[model samples]
Target chain A: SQSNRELVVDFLSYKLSQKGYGMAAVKQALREAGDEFELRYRRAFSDLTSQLHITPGTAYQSFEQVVNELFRDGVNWGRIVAFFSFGGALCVESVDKKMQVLVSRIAAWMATYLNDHLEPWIQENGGWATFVELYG
Target chain B: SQSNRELVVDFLSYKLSQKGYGMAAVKQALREAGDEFELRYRRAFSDLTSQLHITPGTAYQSFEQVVNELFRDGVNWGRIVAFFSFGGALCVESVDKKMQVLVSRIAAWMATYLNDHLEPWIQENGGWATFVELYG
Candidate 1:
């Protein structure tokens, strides 16, 4: 429990803040993560097993479902940013080794999903390298 | 329930922040209020009954017990800040009318206690008026 709480700030919040984004950018990202994302953390917390059918193959399918649904409305940096944050919180709360494995799988899937769907815009906007040079 | 939640933030957090405290100060105050305060909130929540022994004469005695024990070390701003926050939370969580009445009485006693003990330092160091001007 102490480790989880510590990880929340050191690992999760650190990644968000250390990545050299404006407060406006960071706030919007977290906002969209809550307002728009598909993981539905509240629902996940309530009934993790019933709502999610996460076989090894299906985890990718679920990732697709999550990303595809979020993008159907529009593509925004905010949704992508929130994806990691959501997964980070999920990972912290997860106890069973299988659940932790599932989160790792999902996070891997999300990284692929992000590179496919969202990375180019950051590249176009001078990318993370430029961001680090400026604000890191 | 919604109203109560709002009051905790809107009223309590607002007061602490508006009084010129940083998040660290606010958090430490709340932690102390929860961890160390004389009015044990769990007991308050549980019985709100015979255990307290708060008669007209004895309420002051209870108040003294609370303050003297906590301040046995020294009177710092943090503990004073938490005392009000604790009382505010106690008042907020109280559901029954009689319990509310008791909280109000205790609050009145706390004011007297403050006037007797803590207010001068606040006044000499520029008072709530000074704090509001700088922080508000």
Candidate 2:
């Protein structure tokens, strides 16, 4: 319906304004910069998102599930770091509770994977980080 | 009102779990391997955003300035990336007309100087890769 989306920053302000946060400073950021700095990230991000082979359907499902879980469990701050690196945007939120829940569930899943495959510096240090000195 | 506090992450299990990209797999990346792996990034990112800087007035004023300049016309995605690099988790979002506005008022002010001073390489190769190349 809209041709010109008011950048991510603007949306944030409009949204946060409803939450009652100071936005005077935020406005200055854009008004002052002007359009001289075309800020060509939209295409880059879009390309990155697309390259991941992340079908919108797949991405949407992941986002929905995370939001649902967060609402169900209730946590604060989290991320889907796993997804972004391989492909797609991982949901992690610091401010929104829904964001937090999504991250928590995802983090839990990450923790399990790391436990099995990763070795600690302790192992490199000759077995002190995870286990007591093996000299005994 | 708040100190330095902000961050966003993808939080869907399916997001990560989908396409065979699971959280456990992400955990393994962070926990294992000597060479540069994706897991380490996920862990470091969490650690990085886990705590944010709060210079009080500096952070506050920064936020104020950002909104001041960028409130009008249309917003873009580039700004969001700039903010995460500059301010960590200071993000706000909005819905209007038919699209979403994701604004980072703090990013507006901070990004100005950064966008101006940082070398063009980052413009060519963004994010950490650019950081490492420039820093390392």
Candidate 3:
């Protein structure tokens, strides 16, 4: 499958830096997040509402939810939610918090990646016979 | 905790609205979708580099991704993403797409949403947990 476009993280990190957070600190922020970290970012973004000209809660929560959610994948849904949602991204995505993007971008990519790659993979994995069979 | 302020979808969806969208349209869009709908959304977004803006597919994909991933609970992710990502909001979120604020608002919403939600889901699913656990 095509990997995530790196630009997403690059640009987001740049924005975080502009927000006065250092790269390392931003990285740490995203490291293990889930809902708990989302709570913090949601706060940060809410505080920045006047600057971004949008809801800080909205911007940050949207961003943080996406970030924390990235940890959701095939894991048991409950553990994933608690560990990351309660724990935060740095502790989840990277121990060092090196990965950077506002947090929301992660949610966006799956639909992108899935649509881009999964279709073909589904076809490949399932094959037309079973594909039709499943539908049939 | 603290309910994470509000639903991620609600906040981003509103941000999408401020970018110049209406609630009904986005809500209808999500109600109209299922998993397949969102998959199609991502496939369409891959055209961004060439399209330089959103097309129908790109727009639909963006909307679907968020609605489905974050889930509607009280709202619809499909519709929300539609209003927030593709419709007019795409431009709002895009720091680069000043001329296309509507598109940026929604599109940026998804991009940011992906970072916040999808990336962590994929990352933990992608086998990066060992590294992320370091921060935790």
Candidate 4:
């Protein structure tokens, strides 16, 4: 349980870490990867944002549906990073719309999804330590 | 500008720190102070929540108005802690109502208020380092 929380923290720290927040190389690598994923998947990401029409009421369901679809064929590091980028995009949109409350909820939802759905895969893949080794 | 962001991070880290995050003594001291403030001002806090009727649209204005009133008489350590607790309470209420969009907005508003309005007083009071000494 504690380890799960640690992984969640690690994952979040990696994603949300800013200039002074975490290991510089790890942060930079992850940011670059995330940006690349967003750019690569720009059309899909754009279509999802436009089609989902995420509101406070529709956020959780929309997230679940879209994320499930993203992982439909299978999951990999690239797709996973794209998932994080997708969540970030939603937060950005919320901020643009002054819907700031959704940011935390999106974070919480992402953590829950990671902990509940992705933990086993992450562990099998050598967890964040491996992620850091590969990306950082 | 960087220092302001650092202070904002410090203030937030102090307020939001959980197990394994931030300095233990500082986190414990601030949490205890926040809980005590919540208890002391329970009635007022409850009354404000019921009266404010915060919605996605009204959330920002409501936060600004309430926080301004909190600092109206003057700022002090206890009231400042209460202010953080009040923001936390609003977030709780928003979550309860499934209006998750308000949480980040509330946090942003709080940070902006602290940076723009409270920085001088905080510096005068010797900043978070002094608060850590006094409370931690």
* TM-score of each model, in listed order: 0.29, 0.18, 0.20, 0.42
Indicate the docking level reached by candidate 3: incorrect
Q: Quantify all predictions' global Cα lDDT against the true fold.
A: 0.45, 0.28, 0.36, 0.62
Kindly list the per-residue Cα lDDT of model 4 for residues B33-130, writing each as its tens digit.
77777667666653556656778888555566556556544567777777767766666677667887776677677677666555556666676677
Off by over 4 Å in 4: A1-136, B1-25, B44-46
The weakest ten consecutive residues by lDDT in model 1 chain B span: B1-10
| Model 3 ranges with Cα > 4 A deviation | A1-136, B1-100, B127-136
Query: What 10-residue stretch in candidate 4 chain B is worst by lDDT?
Result: B13-22
Please give the TM-score that candidate 2 achieves against the real structure. 0.18
lDDT of 2 by residue, A1-136 (tens): 1101122234333333434433334233432232212233223322332332322234433433333222222111111111222111232122243443343343333233222211121123242211211211
Better of 2 and 4 by DockQ: 2
Q: For candidate 1, give fnat to 2 decimals.
A: 0.00
Task: Report the C-alpha lDDT of model 2 over B24-104, residue by residue, as the tens digit.
Answer: 332232222212323243334333222433332344443433432331111222332333332323321111211122233
Worst 10-residue lDDT window, candidate 3 chain B: B127-136
Model 4 reaches what TM-score against the true structure? 0.42
Per-residue CA lDDT of candidate 1, range A37-108, in tens? 335544443333334445545656454544444443333445444555555544444423345455455556
- Say which prediction, candidate 1 or candidate 4, comes out ahead on TM-score: 4
Please provide, for model 1 over B25-129, each residue's C-alpha lDDT reduced to its tens digit, 9 standing for 90 to 100.
434444444444435544443232334445434556555445544433334555554556555544444423345355546556556655544554454445444
The DockQ scores of all candidates, in the order shown, are: 0.01, 0.02, 0.02, 0.01
Off by over 4 Å in 2: A1-136, B1-40, B60-88, B92-103, B123-136
Give candidate 1 regions above 4 Å deviation: A1-57, A93-98, A129-136, B1-136
What DockQ class does candidate 4 belong to? incorrect
